[PDB]
Amino acid sequence: IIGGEFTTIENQPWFAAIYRRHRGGSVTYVCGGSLISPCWVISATHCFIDYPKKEDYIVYLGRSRLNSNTQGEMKFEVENLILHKDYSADTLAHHNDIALLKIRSKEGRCAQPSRTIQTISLPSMYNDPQFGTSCEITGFGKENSTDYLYPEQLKMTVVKLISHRECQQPHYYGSEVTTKMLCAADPQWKTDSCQGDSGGPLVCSLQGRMTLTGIVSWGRGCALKDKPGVYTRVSHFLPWIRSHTKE
Ligand SMILES: N=C(N)c1ccc(CNC(=O)CNC(=O)[C@@H](CO)NS(=O)(=O)Cc2ccccc2)cc1
Protein backbone atom coordinates (compact mmCIF):
# COMPACT_ATOMS: atom_id res chain seq x y z
CA ILE A 1 0.00 0.00 0.00
CA ILE A 2 1.41 3.35 -1.13
CA GLY A 3 0.53 5.97 1.47
CA GLY A 4 -2.50 5.25 3.62
CA GLU A 5 -2.17 4.26 7.27
CA PHE A 6 -0.88 1.43 9.41
CA THR A 7 -3.66 -0.61 10.97
CA THR A 8 -4.08 -3.85 12.90
CA ILE A 9 -5.88 -7.11 12.12
CA GLU A 10 -8.65 -6.00 14.48
CA ASN A 11 -9.79 -3.48 11.87
CA GLN A 12 -9.51 -5.99 8.98
CA PRO A 13 -10.69 -9.28 10.62
CA TRP A 14 -11.33 -11.02 7.29
CA PHE A 15 -7.82 -10.45 5.90
CA ALA A 16 -5.79 -13.60 5.21
CA ALA A 17 -1.99 -13.67 4.93
CA ILE A 18 -0.66 -16.28 2.49
CA TYR A 19 2.90 -17.60 2.62
CA ARG A 20 4.91 -20.18 0.68
CA ARG A 21 7.40 -22.66 2.15
CA HIS A 22 10.75 -23.12 0.41
CA ARG A 23 13.38 -25.86 0.38
CA GLY A 24 15.35 -25.46 3.60
CA GLY A 25 12.67 -23.89 5.76
CA SER A 26 12.43 -20.26 4.64
CA VAL A 27 8.84 -19.03 4.37
CA THR A 28 8.09 -15.99 2.22
CA TYR A 29 4.94 -13.87 1.88
CA VAL A 30 2.97 -14.43 -1.33
CA CYS A 31 -0.37 -12.65 -1.37
CA GLY A 32 -3.36 -11.34 0.51
CA GLY A 33 -6.71 -13.06 0.73
CA SER A 34 -10.15 -12.78 2.30
CA LEU A 35 -12.06 -15.19 4.52
CA ILE A 36 -15.50 -15.59 2.93
CA SER A 37 -16.52 -18.61 5.00
CA PRO A 38 -15.05 -20.69 7.86
CA CYS A 39 -13.32 -23.05 5.41
CA TRP A 40 -12.66 -20.77 2.43
CA VAL A 41 -10.34 -17.93 1.50
CA ILE A 42 -10.66 -16.11 -1.80
CA SER A 43 -7.61 -14.63 -3.50
CA ALA A 44 -6.05 -14.10 -6.94
CA THR A 45 -5.01 -16.89 -9.31
CA HIS A 46 -1.87 -15.12 -10.58
CA CYS A 47 -0.39 -15.53 -7.08
CA PHE A 48 -0.18 -19.31 -7.46
CA ILE A 49 -0.18 -20.03 -11.20
CA ASP A 50 3.59 -20.68 -11.24
CA TYR A 51 3.51 -23.04 -8.23
CA PRO A 52 0.17 -24.97 -8.21
CA LYS A 53 1.39 -27.20 -5.35
CA LYS A 54 -1.05 -26.73 -2.44
CA GLU A 55 1.33 -28.39 0.04
CA ASP A 56 3.71 -25.41 -0.09
CA TYR A 57 1.30 -22.74 1.08
CA ILE A 58 0.46 -21.52 4.55
CA VAL A 59 -2.51 -19.29 5.40
CA TYR A 60 -2.65 -17.02 8.43
CA LEU A 61 -5.76 -15.45 9.92
CA GLY A 62 -5.73 -12.96 12.78
CA ARG A 63 -2.23 -11.78 11.86
CA SER A 64 -1.17 -8.11 11.92
CA ARG A 65 2.54 -8.45 11.16
CA LEU A 66 4.51 -9.92 8.28
CA ASN A 67 7.35 -11.73 10.05
CA SER A 68 6.23 -12.04 13.67
CA ASN A 69 3.31 -13.65 15.50
CA THR A 70 0.14 -11.97 16.77
CA GLN A 71 -1.88 -13.16 19.75
CA GLY A 72 -4.98 -15.00 18.58
CA GLU A 73 -3.64 -15.81 15.10
CA MET A 74 -4.32 -19.19 13.53
CA LYS A 75 -2.21 -21.22 11.08
CA PHE A 76 -3.80 -23.23 8.25
CA GLU A 77 -2.80 -25.70 5.55
CA VAL A 78 -4.40 -25.55 2.10
CA GLU A 79 -6.67 -28.55 1.60
CA ASN A 80 -7.51 -27.50 -1.94
CA LEU A 81 -6.23 -24.77 -4.27
CA ILE A 82 -8.76 -23.74 -6.90
CA LEU A 83 -7.37 -21.67 -9.78
CA HIS A 84 -9.61 -20.28 -12.51
CA LYS A 85 -9.23 -22.18 -15.80
CA ASP A 86 -9.63 -19.18 -18.11
CA TYR A 87 -6.92 -17.18 -16.39
CA SER A 88 -4.56 -15.36 -18.74
CA ALA A 89 -2.21 -12.39 -18.63
CA ASP A 90 -1.83 -9.97 -21.52
CA THR A 91 0.41 -6.91 -21.84
CA LEU A 92 -1.16 -5.44 -18.69
CA ALA A 93 -4.54 -7.03 -18.05
CA HIS A 94 -4.89 -10.19 -15.99
CA HIS A 95 -8.13 -11.96 -16.86
CA ASN A 96 -10.20 -14.01 -14.39
CA ASP A 97 -7.65 -13.33 -11.67
CA ILE A 98 -9.54 -15.08 -8.88
CA ALA A 99 -8.83 -18.12 -6.72
CA LEU A 100 -10.22 -20.20 -3.86
CA LEU A 101 -8.19 -21.75 -1.06
CA LYS A 102 -9.92 -24.27 1.18
CA ILE A 103 -8.27 -24.25 4.58
CA ARG A 104 -7.89 -26.58 7.55
CA SER A 105 -5.77 -26.55 10.69
CA LYS A 106 -3.54 -29.49 11.63
CA GLU A 107 -6.44 -30.82 13.71
CA GLY A 108 -8.61 -30.76 10.59
CA ARG A 109 -10.76 -27.77 11.60
CA CYS A 110 -11.67 -24.57 9.76
CA ALA A 111 -11.51 -21.02 11.13
CA GLN A 112 -13.05 -20.16 14.50
CA PRO A 113 -14.69 -16.71 14.76
CA SER A 114 -12.90 -14.36 17.14
CA ARG A 115 -12.37 -10.63 17.44
CA THR A 116 -9.43 -10.91 15.05
CA ILE A 117 -10.96 -13.42 12.63
CA GLN A 118 -14.26 -12.95 10.78
CA THR A 119 -15.80 -13.54 7.37
CA ILE A 120 -16.55 -10.80 4.86
CA SER A 121 -19.85 -10.77 2.95
CA LEU A 122 -20.01 -11.52 -0.77
CA PRO A 123 -21.95 -9.15 -3.07
CA SER A 124 -25.20 -9.90 -4.91
CA MET A 125 -25.48 -10.72 -8.62
CA TYR A 126 -24.43 -7.68 -10.66
CA ASN A 127 -24.99 -5.29 -7.74
CA ASP A 128 -21.96 -3.06 -7.16
CA PRO A 129 -21.57 0.35 -5.49
CA GLN A 130 -22.13 3.52 -7.51
CA PHE A 131 -19.04 4.91 -9.24
CA GLY A 132 -17.38 7.58 -7.11
CA THR A 133 -18.01 5.52 -3.96
CA SER A 134 -15.23 5.19 -1.39
CA CYS A 135 -13.87 1.71 -0.59
CA GLU A 136 -10.89 0.38 1.35
CA ILE A 137 -7.96 -1.95 0.57
CA THR A 138 -5.54 -3.77 2.88
CA GLY A 139 -2.19 -5.39 2.27
CA PHE A 140 1.40 -6.08 3.24
CA GLY A 141 2.56 -4.79 -0.14
CA LYS A 142 5.14 -2.16 -1.03
CA GLU A 143 4.98 1.38 0.32
CA ASN A 144 7.06 2.70 -2.56
CA SER A 145 7.56 1.34 -6.07
CA THR A 146 11.32 1.42 -5.45
CA ASP A 147 11.26 -0.72 -2.28
CA TYR A 148 12.41 -4.35 -2.53
CA LEU A 149 11.06 -5.20 0.92
CA TYR A 150 7.55 -5.24 2.36
CA PRO A 151 6.34 -3.24 5.38
CA GLU A 152 6.41 -5.26 8.60
CA GLN A 153 2.95 -4.02 9.66
CA LEU A 154 -0.39 -4.37 7.87
CA LYS A 155 -1.67 -1.25 6.07
CA MET A 156 -4.85 0.12 4.54
CA THR A 157 -6.12 3.06 2.51
CA VAL A 158 -9.23 4.45 0.84
CA VAL A 159 -9.87 4.88 -2.87
CA LYS A 160 -12.78 5.66 -5.14
CA LEU A 161 -14.42 3.50 -7.77
CA ILE A 162 -13.94 4.80 -11.31
CA SER A 163 -16.55 4.22 -14.03
CA HIS A 164 -15.79 1.68 -16.72
CA ARG A 165 -16.15 4.50 -19.28
CA GLU A 166 -13.44 6.61 -17.64
CA CYS A 167 -11.03 3.70 -17.13
CA GLN A 168 -11.41 2.79 -20.79
CA GLN A 169 -10.13 6.20 -21.93
CA PRO A 170 -6.98 6.19 -24.13
CA HIS A 171 -4.77 7.74 -21.44
CA TYR A 172 -6.02 5.25 -18.87
CA TYR A 173 -6.12 1.59 -19.91
CA GLY A 174 -8.08 1.61 -23.14
CA SER A 175 -9.63 -1.74 -24.06
CA GLU A 176 -7.34 -3.65 -21.70
CA VAL A 177 -9.96 -3.28 -18.97
CA THR A 178 -13.20 -5.25 -19.35
CA THR A 179 -16.53 -5.37 -17.51
CA LYS A 180 -15.26 -8.22 -15.33
CA MET A 181 -12.81 -5.74 -13.79
CA LEU A 182 -13.22 -2.65 -11.59
CA CYS A 183 -10.96 0.41 -11.47
CA ALA A 184 -10.29 2.38 -8.32
CA ALA A 185 -7.88 5.13 -7.32
CA ASP A 186 -7.31 8.18 -5.20
CA PRO A 187 -8.59 11.28 -7.02
CA GLN A 188 -5.25 12.93 -6.18
CA TRP A 189 -3.23 9.85 -7.18
CA LYS A 190 -1.41 9.80 -3.83
CA THR A 191 -2.49 6.48 -2.33
CA ASP A 192 -2.91 3.11 -4.03
CA SER A 193 -2.38 -0.64 -3.83
CA CYS A 194 0.94 -1.98 -5.07
CA GLN A 195 3.07 -5.07 -5.72
CA GLY A 196 2.48 -7.46 -2.82
CA ASP A 197 -1.14 -6.40 -2.23
CA SER A 198 -2.50 -8.88 -4.82
CA GLY A 199 -5.32 -11.16 -3.77
CA GLY A 200 -6.23 -8.74 -1.00
CA PRO A 201 -9.74 -7.26 -0.54
CA LEU A 202 -11.39 -4.16 -1.99
CA VAL A 203 -14.12 -3.52 0.59
CA CYS A 204 -17.09 -1.23 0.09
CA SER A 205 -19.97 -0.40 2.39
CA LEU A 206 -23.05 -1.27 0.35
CA GLN A 207 -26.42 -0.55 1.96
CA GLY A 208 -24.86 -0.37 5.41
CA ARG A 209 -22.81 -3.54 5.00
CA MET A 210 -19.14 -4.35 4.32
CA THR A 211 -18.89 -6.18 1.02
CA LEU A 212 -15.98 -7.85 -0.79
CA THR A 213 -16.39 -5.87 -4.02
CA GLY A 214 -13.03 -6.71 -5.56
CA ILE A 215 -9.70 -8.49 -5.42
CA VAL A 216 -6.40 -6.65 -5.98
CA SER A 217 -5.17 -7.81 -9.37
CA TRP A 218 -3.16 -5.37 -11.50
CA GLY A 219 -2.06 -1.90 -12.52
CA ARG A 220 0.63 0.07 -14.35
CA GLY A 221 3.15 1.21 -11.76
CA CYS A 222 1.81 2.24 -8.32
CA ALA A 223 -0.04 5.49 -7.64
CA LEU A 224 0.77 6.76 -11.13
CA LYS A 225 -1.49 9.49 -12.57
CA ASP A 226 -4.35 8.12 -14.70
CA LYS A 227 -3.22 4.57 -13.97
CA PRO A 228 -5.89 3.25 -11.51
CA GLY A 229 -5.71 -0.06 -9.69
CA VAL A 230 -7.65 -2.82 -11.41
CA TYR A 231 -9.70 -5.24 -9.34
CA THR A 232 -11.38 -8.51 -10.21
CA ARG A 233 -15.12 -7.78 -10.07
CA VAL A 234 -16.36 -10.29 -7.50
CA SER A 235 -20.04 -9.87 -8.41
CA HIS A 236 -19.42 -11.39 -11.85
CA PHE A 237 -17.91 -14.56 -10.42
CA LEU A 238 -20.58 -15.64 -7.94
CA PRO A 239 -21.59 -18.62 -10.11
CA TRP A 240 -17.97 -19.74 -10.27
CA ILE A 241 -17.51 -19.24 -6.52
CA ARG A 242 -20.56 -21.30 -5.48
CA SER A 243 -19.95 -24.25 -7.81
CA HIS A 244 -16.44 -24.74 -6.42
CA THR A 245 -17.25 -24.30 -2.73
CA LYS A 246 -20.05 -26.88 -2.52
CA GLU A 247 -18.44 -30.33 -2.46
N1 LIG B 1 -3.13 -0.28 -8.03
C1 LIG B 1 -1.97 -0.66 -8.59
N2 LIG B 1 -1.38 0.36 -9.21
C2 LIG B 1 -1.43 -1.95 -8.55
C3 LIG B 1 -2.23 -3.05 -8.01
C4 LIG B 1 -1.72 -4.38 -7.89
C5 LIG B 1 -0.38 -4.66 -8.34
C6 LIG B 1 -0.02 -6.10 -8.20
N3 LIG B 1 -0.04 -6.93 -9.33
C7 LIG B 1 1.01 -7.05 -10.20
O1 LIG B 1 2.13 -6.55 -10.11
C8 LIG B 1 0.72 -7.92 -11.42
N4 LIG B 1 1.24 -7.20 -12.56
C9 LIG B 1 0.85 -6.01 -13.13
O2 LIG B 1 -0.10 -5.34 -12.80
C10 LIG B 1 1.71 -5.51 -14.27
C11 LIG B 1 1.08 -5.69 -15.67
O3 LIG B 1 0.37 -6.84 -16.03
N5 LIG B 1 1.96 -4.10 -14.33
S1 LIG B 1 3.29 -3.57 -13.54
O4 LIG B 1 4.47 -4.27 -13.96
O5 LIG B 1 3.20 -2.15 -13.84
C12 LIG B 1 3.21 -3.64 -11.75
C13 LIG B 1 4.35 -3.30 -10.85
C14 LIG B 1 5.42 -4.28 -10.67
C15 LIG B 1 6.56 -3.97 -9.81
C16 LIG B 1 6.62 -2.68 -9.09
C17 LIG B 1 5.55 -1.69 -9.28
C18 LIG B 1 4.41 -2.01 -10.14
C19 LIG B 1 0.48 -3.60 -8.87
C20 LIG B 1 -0.07 -2.28 -9.01
From Swiss-Prot:
Q: Which residues form the Peptidase S1 domain?
A: 1-246
Cysteine disulfide links: 31-47, 39-110, 135-204, 167-183, 194-222
| Phosphoserine sites (modified residues) | 145
Where does the record place the catalytic residues?
A: 46, 97, 198
Which top-rank group of organisms is this from?
Answer: Eukaryota
List of glycosylated residues? 144
User: What name appears for this protein in its UniProt entry?
Assistant: Urokinase-type plasminogen activator chain B
What gene name is given for the protein in this entry? PLAU
